[PDB]
């Protein structure tokens, strides 16, 4: 009902689809970063995953922070020594936007292991706000996922949590995931989750809503499927650990399908 805003969900979907195009990072941004790499970014995002679970932050907060980070690094060159400072300020901004009870600035200083000062954290907050032009209401994979979830016949918590997990895995790996829009990754993640748990495929009703088909999702899905298979071997493991928790139905323990037939 009203919690699902029947009268506004299309308007909102359409608007997010527009905004995800505006809020998109530069796909090729890391090659133009002289001192940082996909591998360092992966370490940062993985860390922010740990910070969110330590402070019991929403998953939306996590997605927003990554969006802020990727956009910032799209126009600003950063030394490896300061990548964490950017990440910290992003998490703060994301928390202040999205959390009922954001962690205090001092806690943000604390988790950086006294690498940075309270003063440094706050001045970067200011810089990120300058660079993003306060454009913080970004569409995330989660905002799309939760709408897609309304198309399950019937609702399945293993499906939902698994989709969330896969979406989160994509945040870690700029190559290849920077090239896909949140809505497309969410589509891939939803279908893969659904297939894995129930054998069923991307619903026609979601073809109506999104205009996406298995045809158009195929590239992303082949990448997401590989990310899923290799996930136990990835250098970064914080998302897998997180999704062992019962809160998320221990979905990281489910077995990926060996093939998609797609």
């Amino acid at each position: 009902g009203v919690n699902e805003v029947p009268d506004y969900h299309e308007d909102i979907h359409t608007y997010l689809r527009e905004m995800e195009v505006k809020c998109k990072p530069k796909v090729g941004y890391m090659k133009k970063q002289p001192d940082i790499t996909n591998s360092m970014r992966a370490i940062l995002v993985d860390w922010l995953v740990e910070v969110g679970e330590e402070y019991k932050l929403q998953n939306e907060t996590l997605h927003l922070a990554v969006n802020y980070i990727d956009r910032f690094l799209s126009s600003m060159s950063v030394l490896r020594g300061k990548l964490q400072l950017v990440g910290t300020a992003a998490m703060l901004l994301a928390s202040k936007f999205e959390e009922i009870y954001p962690p205090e600035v001092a806690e943000f200083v604390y988790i950086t292991d006294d690498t940075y000062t309270k003063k440094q954290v706050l001045r970067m907050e200011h810089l990120v706000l300058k660079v993003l032009a306060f454009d913080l209401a970004a569409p995330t994979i989660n905002q799309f996922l939760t709408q897609y979830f309304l198309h399950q016949q019937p609702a399945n918590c293993k499906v939902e949590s698994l989709a969330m997990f896969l979406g989160e895995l994509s945040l870690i790996d700029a190559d290849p995931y920077l090239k896909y829009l949140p809505s497309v990754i969410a589509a891939a993640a939803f279908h893969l989750a659904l297939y894995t748990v129930t054998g069923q495929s991307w619903p026609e009703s979601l073809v109506q809503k999104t205009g996406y088909t298995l045809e158009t999702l195929k590239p992303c899905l082949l990448d997401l499927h590989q990310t899923y298979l290799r996930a136990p071997q990835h250098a970064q493991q914080s998302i897998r650990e997180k999704y062992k928790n019962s809160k998320y139905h221990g979905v990281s323990l489910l077995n990926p399908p060996e093939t998609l037939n797609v």
Partner: protein, 293 residues
């Protein structure tokens, strides 16, 4: 954006608040009258406040004739200036000072119709206002009325998650919040507008409570105490108590006597207990009450 305080001449203070002080000001190059809301960051050990981050980020996206426009944001290490479109008055002051024998029906309809446009625009852009009250509705000399003060607003997801509780100034606060409901949605903004519609007619607040529990009881005594028939789930709600007095719903023509049949219809749909049946802004724009607006 492209602004500097050297181009503004302050004129008078026009209001204050936790946010800070607001000045009426004039652009010396273009002639534009603006409102400047100053946010002190030098006084801030917690950096840029979350209210300001929401207000700015959410208003950047909302361009609509019935939402006050954010023209600019001036950045300083010490200060933060929000430059707003200027509007001479707010609805509360218009009600207290000039509306002594009433607001005429044409003008009530016009304002309510414009408020619904503004609110429908918010909801279509996944924004809850969460503080709609007459003080936060600005009127100009041309007859426009505009949603202002998005400091308590929030960007929602679909479906909504649990957000902050006890939002909304008490008199304007929806029963689902007062009953501690885990989830609230666009229906809370409609409730507020409903309260405001009544208030424009009578010039007095509809439910002026002194406590959450007094607020509820005032509502219950006006619309009757809700049960599982009028509002499925009500008796399962976290702060619903079975001991609640059971008041009979009084005839709606007694709630706002001067209101006509169309008026009463629309108001009743705005003040429906069940958030699921409560009318949307989008739907309310088509209500017969507006036929002659």
């Amino acid at each position: 954006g492209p602004g500097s305080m050297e181009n503004f001449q302050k004129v008078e203070k026009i209001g204050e608040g936790t946010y800070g002080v607001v000045y009426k000001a004039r652009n010396k190059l273009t002639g534009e009258v603006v409102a400047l809301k100053k946010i002190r960051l030098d006084t801030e050990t917690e950096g840029v406040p979350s209210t300001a981050i929401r207000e700015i980020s959410l208003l950047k996206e909302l361009n609509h004739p019935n939402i006050v426009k954010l023209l600019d944001v001036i950045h300083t290490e010490n200060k933060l200036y929000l430059v707003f479109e200027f509007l001479h008055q707010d609805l509360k002051k218009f009600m207290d000072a000039s509306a002594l024998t009433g607001i005429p029906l044409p003008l009530i309809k016009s304002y309510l119709f414009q408020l619904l446009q503004g609110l429908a625009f918010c909801h279509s852009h996944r924004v809850l206002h969460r503080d709609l009250k007459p003080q936060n509705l600005l009127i100009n000399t041309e007859g426009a009325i505009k949603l202002a003060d998005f400091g308590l607003a929030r960007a929602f997801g679909v479906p909504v998650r649990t957000y902050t509780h006890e939002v909304v100034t008490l008199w304007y606060r929806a029963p689902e919040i007062l009953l501690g409901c885990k989830y609230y949605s666009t229906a809370v903004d409609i409730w507020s507008l409903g309260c405001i519609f009544a208030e424009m007619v009578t010039r007095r607040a509809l439910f002026p409570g002194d406590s959450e529990i007094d607020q509820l009881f005032r509502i219950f005594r006006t619309l009757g105490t809700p049960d599982e028939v009028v509002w499925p789930g009500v008796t399962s709600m976290p702060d619903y108590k079975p001991s609640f007095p059971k008041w009979a719903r009084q005839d709606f023509s007694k709630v706002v006597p001067p209101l006509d049949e169309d008026g009463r219809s629309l108001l009743s749909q705005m003040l429906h207990y069940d958030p699921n049946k409560r009318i949307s802004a989008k739907a309310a724009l088509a209500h017969p009450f507006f036929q002659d607006v």
